[PDB]
């Protein structure tokens, strides 16, 4: 109302595409797909992990953060031994939480959820 404004670290999608442009496609999606969530997934700067082929994702609102984590690992083509960690607003999100709950708490003003991944906790 009285609702917190979420500011995150520097994402590349947040360098390529002015806020007025990022915003626009944001409200366009949530009206076209109310049951799903727009998520931007990028590699952390110093992280030693393979870069993601595609970084724009439409995720079901009732899918857990943990399930999306295993989904990304399969896309990064990590093996069963590799370490990977999500950072949403520079904090590691709970696995039990749903992507809908995570979006509602950590979406920026452009109606985009930003998830960063690394092999360490920075």
Residue numbers in the entry: 0 to 121
How does the study describe this entry?
To obtain the complex structures, we created chimeric proteins consisting of the mATG8 C‐terminally fused to the LIR sequence with a Gly/Ser linker. Crystals diffracted to 2.50 Å for PLEKHM1629–638‐LC3A2–121, 2.00 Å for PLEKHM1629–638‐GABARAP2–117 and 2.90 Å for PLEKHM1629–638‐GABARAP‐L12–117. W635 interacts with E17 in GABARAP and GABARAP‐L1 with distances of 3.5 Å and 4.3 Å. In comparison, R28 in the GABARAP subfamily proteins is always hydrogen‐bonded to N637 with a generally shorter bond distance and the geometry of the hydrogen bond between the arginine and asparagine is close to optimal for a hydrogen bond (N‐H…..O angles are as follows: LC3A 16.6°, LC3B 48.3°, LC3C 26.7°; GABARAP 4.7°, GABARAP‐L1 6.9°). Additionally, in the GABARAP subfamily structures, this hydrogen bond is stabilized by coordinated cation–π interaction of R28 guanidinium moiety and corresponding Y25 aromatic side chain. V51 GABARAPs’ side chains are in close proximity to the PLEKHM1 V638 (3.8 and 4.3 Å for GABARAP and GABARAP‐L1, respectively), while side chains of residues in equivalent positions of LC3 subfamily proteins are further away (LC3A/B/C V54/V54/V60 – 4.2/4.6/4.6 Å). Similarly, GABARAPs’ L55 side chain are closer to the PLEKHM1 V638 (4.6 and 4.8 Å for GABARAP and GABARAP‐L1, respectively); LC3A/LC3B/LC3C V58/V58/L64 are distanced to PLEKHM1 V638 at 5.5/5.4/4.3 Å. In the GABARAPs complex structures, the corresponding R67 side chains are flexible and the salt bridges are absent. This is likely due the increased flexibility of the GABARAPs D45 residues, which are not visible in the electron density maps. Superimposition of LC3C and GABARAP‐L1 α2 helix (having biggest difference in orientation) in other projection (obtained from structures above after rotation in 90° around x‐axis).
